[PDB]
Design a protein around this ligand. Structure first.
Ligand SMILES: *CC(=O)N1CCC(NC(=O)c2ccccc2)CC1
Ligand SMILES: *CC(=O)N1CCC(NC(=O)c2ccccc2)CC1
Lengths: 304, 304
């Protein structure tokens, strides 16, 4: 029993983190096979970052200007290219610790672990979600750019995120590992405001299932609802619309608990309308939305 | 910016987890040097667990009854002893992945990372605290016993916890790595009830500092208090008494923010008396008490 916000074990990814220095800027790179991936803003002076022309800035850079250090050993750079907003530094040595890996582009609502690094050294690991506004709510200080987000399927690491930007509101923007930003954000120090941070309805319901499975049941009630009725209340409270696809995805948790998805919807409706009344659910005073249905089944069944 | 519940990177500990089977019971062991550490209840039948005599049960066990598997390779057991509530299985091979390590016994209020494992395989990592009642609030299913709690100081892993027991109330009890239970708990299926789960006052204050550092400031007020006055309000709300030692420990966060510890005490007093009024602090609707002052400085300065 018990239910915790849980990160993937980080060893496989720890084995891929290096330090990248270009001029006076140090941040993190990802070493997979003979390629090191890093944010292209490594080539910027703080000055450049106001309106950088990356193709023009890159012309002034040679392979020998990209200092790549794995622990205390230097790596030899034999090539460099820009793909979107990442640099790919080709090195003469394949990472001997390369795990099986994929590059995946996740959807909003999907969760992943972040290994926060500084100067290519891991500081900690925590669980995130891609927000509906395509931001993430991270912990990232100067030097943490190039930290990555990942899922693990048994022995295969799926890299979904590389950290690039803090918005003036203290939320975070980055890319997939092809260097394409999640959402409308750019690697430029400009006016960029996040949209509405809506709540991931399907994740909340999954977490309500996790609560029942673990003994927290006070919020169960005698009511049901419809998708359309529920969605009226979702709209008013800035929750994502619930689709039949979301209902279908919650089917296994429905099966295990014997609580129909739409009955659990009626519980969530009352919680939105009435509040918690100073009570808690799995040690939280608000409705948690950074557990996917997949996360809940994984943790409640003990997958490794 | 940003502040997240953050676990230590888990690679160093992943490299120490093995599977231990005695009869029909499988759980996790910790392989450091040529010793595998595991809960002595591995030798129990579910039946034994009502009133086990461990010395008598152990007589019926030989080295060859302890099946120890590191990934897919079996380890040869050449010795076994009981120390308190752990078994030490001597193996003929030193773990080549042994990190620098210590065994430490932590105090209530101190935090640590747990690497949840099943059949010697890591499933995830999360941050905990030793509760004032000497329980922890974990996520532990059947097969997770022998999972360990740790801190990392740069390159040295300090092992503080091994998972042994779930109480009927869904909270968790275990040992240090000398096999001594935290608190009054025993490895017996009996009536064991946790005491008052009081709030770790010094941790809450540390987290309030983390909030100010990261821009969440609405709860700052025009008031101050005294240790004695604050402690009257702490008592009523089941908070640990605040000592001068705790004030001294918060000094650096005091220095950095320029908010006197006793002013921050007056903020915490008003929050206890008035509630959150539907507002949040670092994305939480309750006062977080599983960040130590040390955790807050570490994360806010980016130590690796
Ligand atoms: C995220 C990361 O590690 N970095 C990106 C930000 C870099 N610093 C700056 O360019 C900067 C900070 C503040 C004002 C102006 C410029 C450090 C590396
Ligand atoms: C924690 C862990 O991995 N284990 C301890 C509990 C073991 N199961 C039992 O002895 C048991 C469970 C339920 C009823 C009776 C006995 C599995 C291993």
């Amino acid at each position: 029993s018990g239910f915790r916000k849980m990160a993937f074990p980080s060893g496989k990814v720890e084995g891929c983190m290096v330090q990248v220095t270009c001029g006076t800027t140090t941040l993190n790179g990802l070493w997979l096979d003979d390629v090191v991936y890093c944010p292209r803003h490594v080539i910027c002076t703080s000055e450049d970052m106001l309106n950088p022309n990356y193709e023009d800035l890159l012309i002034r850079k040679s392979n020998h200007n990209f200092l790549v250090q794995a622990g205390n050993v230097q790596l030899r750079v034999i090539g460099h290219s820009m793909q979107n907003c990442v640099l790919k530094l080709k090195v003469d040595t394949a990472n001997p610790k390369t795990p099986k890996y994929k590059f995946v582009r996740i959807q909003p609502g999907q969760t992943f672990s972040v290994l926060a690094c500084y100067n290519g050294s891991p500081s900690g690991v925590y669980q995130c979600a891609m927000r509906p506004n395509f931001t993430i709510k991270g912990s990232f200080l100067n030097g943490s750019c190039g930290s990555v987000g990942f899922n693990i399927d048994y022995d295969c690491v799926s890299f979904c995120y590389m950290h690039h930007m803090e918005l003036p509101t203290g939320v975070h923007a980055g890319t997939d590992l092809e260097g394409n930003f999640y959402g409308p954000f750019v690697d430029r120090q400009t006016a960029q405001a996040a949209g509405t941070d809506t709540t991931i309805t399907v994740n909340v319901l999954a977490w309500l299932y996790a609560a029942v499975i673990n003994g927290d049941r006070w919020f169960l009630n005698r009511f049901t609802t419809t998708l359309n009725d529920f969605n009226l209340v979702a709209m008013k409270y800035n929750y994502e619309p619930l689709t039949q696809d979301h209902v279908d995805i919650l089917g296994p948790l429905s099966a295990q608990t014997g609580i129909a998805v739409l009955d659990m919807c009626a519980s969530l409706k009352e919680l939105l309308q009435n509040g918690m009344n100073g009570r808690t659910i799995l040690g939280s005073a608000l409705l948690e939305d950074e557990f996917t249905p997949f996360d809940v089944v994984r943790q409640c069944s003990g997958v490794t």
